[PDB]
Design a protein around this nucleic acid. Sequence first.
DNA 1: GGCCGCCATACTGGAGAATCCCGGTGCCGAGGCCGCTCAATTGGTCGTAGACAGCTCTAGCACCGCTTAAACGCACGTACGCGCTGTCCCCCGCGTTTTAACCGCCAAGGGGATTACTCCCTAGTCTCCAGGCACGTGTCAGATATATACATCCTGTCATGTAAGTA
DNA 2: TACTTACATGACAGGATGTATATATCTGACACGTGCCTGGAGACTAGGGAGTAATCCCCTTGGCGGTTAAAACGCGGGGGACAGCGCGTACGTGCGTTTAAGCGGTGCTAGAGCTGTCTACGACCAATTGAGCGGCCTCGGCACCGGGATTCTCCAGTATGGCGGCC
Lengths: 97, 97, 109, 109, 83, 83, 95, 95
Amino acid sequence: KPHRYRPGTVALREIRRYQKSTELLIRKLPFQRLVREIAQDFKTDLRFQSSAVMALQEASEAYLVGLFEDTNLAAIHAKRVTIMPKDIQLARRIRGE
Amino acid sequence: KPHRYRPGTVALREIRRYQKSTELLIRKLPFQRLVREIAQDFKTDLRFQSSAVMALQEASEAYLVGLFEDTNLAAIHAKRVTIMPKDIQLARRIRGE
Amino acid sequence: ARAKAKTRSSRAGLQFPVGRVHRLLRKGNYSERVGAGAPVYLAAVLEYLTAEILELAGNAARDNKKTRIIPRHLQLAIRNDEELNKLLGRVTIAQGGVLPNIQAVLLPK
Amino acid sequence: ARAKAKTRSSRAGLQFPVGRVHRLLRKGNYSERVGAGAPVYLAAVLEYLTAEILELAGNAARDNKKTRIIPRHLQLAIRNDEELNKLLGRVTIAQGGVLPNIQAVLLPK
Amino acid sequence: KVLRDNIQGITKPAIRRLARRGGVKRISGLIYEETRGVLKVFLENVIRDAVTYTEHAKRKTVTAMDVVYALKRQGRTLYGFGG
Amino acid sequence: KVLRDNIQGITKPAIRRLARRGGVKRISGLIYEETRGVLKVFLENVIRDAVTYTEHAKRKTVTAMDVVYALKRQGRTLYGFGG
Amino acid sequence: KRSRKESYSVYVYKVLKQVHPDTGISSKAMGIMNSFVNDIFERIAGEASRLAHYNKRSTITSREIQTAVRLLLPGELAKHAVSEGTKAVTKYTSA
Amino acid sequence: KRSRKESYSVYVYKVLKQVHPDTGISSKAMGIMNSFVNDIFERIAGEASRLAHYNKRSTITSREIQTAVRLLLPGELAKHAVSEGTKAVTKYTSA
DNA sequence: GGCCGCCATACTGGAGAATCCCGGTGCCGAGGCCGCTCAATTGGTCGTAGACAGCTCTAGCACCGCTTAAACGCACGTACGCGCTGTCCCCCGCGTTTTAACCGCCAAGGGGATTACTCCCTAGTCTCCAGGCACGTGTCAGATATATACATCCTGTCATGTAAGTA
DNA sequence: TACTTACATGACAGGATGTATATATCTGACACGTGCCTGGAGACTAGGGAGTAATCCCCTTGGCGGTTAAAACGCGGGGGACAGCGCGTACGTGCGTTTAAGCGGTGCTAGAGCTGTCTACGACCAATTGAGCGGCCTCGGCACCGGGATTCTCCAGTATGGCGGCC
């Protein structure tokens, strides 16, 4: 029988590993293309320093992880282990947004 | 029989009556006594402009109202109406306190 | 012998003081030198902003059948406008109360 | 016939550039005159915070058996000092990672 | 002249009134002391800033402008008191 | 020349890994699209300011330092890119 | 003997009667207006100082103020303010 | 060459060798501490400008800086910063 | 099965107190008017800031090529969220009592702000020197690699909660 | 009816494998040596800003007499919170496949950034004015008050649906 883990175990291992690890979890180049396509939504033919792209990146994942920590706070306050989007909408209202 | 409203009816009447209200909900003299009390710990013989006392009063009242707004958003998030201090602690800690 | 005194606020045709806003910007230690269009542009922005504030206050007062502005009208004026709310999310108003706001779960049935 | 040009950081017995901080405050538009002990006091505060942070960073580096200051060490040090934490609550560290934080409800029986 | 227990001077029905302004229908028994504590902490922070202002102003009388600036530094800016 | 869909490029497993870094143990399938929406809103809010900085700078190439300025304006100050 | 304290009373009174001739006012509402005008004034002024610092500008001009308007003032109000400000500097240069 | 840009490399390195003679430092962390010292310098500078405005003081002194420290810095950080700055200003006052 | 009769459960009218709501009366604060004063502007002047042109050179962009992490998609194991019923208890509402908050009145002086005097201080400027930045360049900490231990979480077995026989 | 016992599902007890734990290496970012010029610094100095004395007056602080408003205490009661179990569920995890990301490799010029000009551009001083704020009072919109109407809310007779029993 091939080995298989119970649910949450790989989730928890990933939790531990990326709490330990510090690297970016999103591919940089689709992020860069998204940055450029939303740039041309404001001003066409903009150019971006790569440092600006990664700076926007680490800002983005930091903002995201802050929202998800608030999401887990709401979800355990909702007595739950699975988050639903209303947790995020709630937290977004709590932050004043 | 004497007239008796069902539980929550007078509560909702208080809801509408104090949202339409604009006046301060704290007795002025014990609030002034409390601010003198706490401020005496930090600096002795402190004197208070009464307008500053009502300024602290209204600011604290609205800060608490915003706190209970966050709280009952968490409570309807938590499928409850009897708010409990963990809701306030959730609102504070998601807010960052 | 001298030019007639005709103020720059009248040059803008606007009631907000060009001179007072200019001297508050110069005294406020933001830069030692200020472009000429900066205070007139600022005063135009401020007078316009206060103009929609006064519009919403006026309709709020007319709704509550009083001719005079009360800060309850200011509460209803600010908190019912989404861009004003985004401007003043963290701003506290004296004796304003709150919006008439009840969640649907609090109502009977 | 001037004497030796001594440095004001060493006059304070300190490492942070007094001249740089004083010049920045003269060019930062905060007051046109700056009190004489103000940049010395400021640099002393800055060096005190910097020194305690670098001490924590070196201790955290020694904790994970590394000899070089890493931004992960900066995260694990500053975010684990609660007064530095609420001093720097809304501040993001590039490639610092996150604190190891598992909720007790998330851990199994 | 010393004051000891004026946190109870912010009365239980005043807490109920504030939660009615907050739109709270049902309030548990554990609520009131926690509200007293958190308002105590908030007031302590604000008047700590205000007392710092006042001693830095070399004054003895607490003024409402100091209250305004203290609330500004906590991101709780108040309109309507001479600001 | 133009691009139409790269918000998809913030992929679902990337969101999953972040929620592992954010401490989420179980992620609904409804989570990913609305997280994309709210990060979309946030990045628009940042980049609108950054572009405003950029034509305020009379430049055509976006630099990281204005991104730092926009983040510091929005209360999400980032260390590691200033200067 | 007293010392004058400056406030924005007469200007807000002027524009109120310009837009609502029949509408009254309370004084503490005017206190909230004074707090508003100083608050938004210092927001815009600090942002303009920031933009002057970032682009190494020793002078804060209308471009700085307009930039600060697009930053802080959100959306539709920003576009209106840009519009009447452009009108306002235009008629000002013609005056 | 290029234009000299001021940074806080050497002063942080001197302070590091004061607290940890044995260790090294990454350049990424170095830029982070440059951002740190610039950011906290900006916070304290703006706060001192605010208080000089409130007291109508044309000059920011170490009294104002100490007030700003007691505002921003929490508790023992504030009081040991007071002690360190006081010791430093006594040494500089005594040259 | 139809028919008739009986229970169940909400349908609904009715009534009375709380609050709008309509009309009457004082009152207080808007506001509007009068006197002062400061500020705001103008002309000019003088210093200077950055806009503009323009070069240049360099990293972003475009193009190209090999690799494999990504990713994603389907299957499936398995745990999730929440609701029914119930269950236990907890403030809400509805009073009475009481007391001190409030309001009106009285006396004290604190200190805050204002003017004047004073003198402490701080930057400007000019110049001079030295220390950190730019550059350059060795060099070992660790990035990467290969080999091994142990968690560790999963997997295979204990244990007692509860169902059942019977003294 | 309780005591014991079986059994089977929740509890008790040991291994594959992903990450932890042992060096080997080679490199390029750490780390240190070198020219430099710019960045700090010092003496005077002209001038300006804050500390200090007085003081006064007005605004705060303490005291007092009633008055319910507000707090406070207590009791009936409906609602609230929420867990055990159930049940459709919804997503984690396996793991192979695809592909475009990732790495690495080239060419180039757009514009980033740096350099000379120059004129706009705007701060600043004496003077002069005109708007704009201190002061006051006063009168009519609004606060307070009495009396219906409305309005809302709780209940109780009820009709009707639903359901059973007899013919």
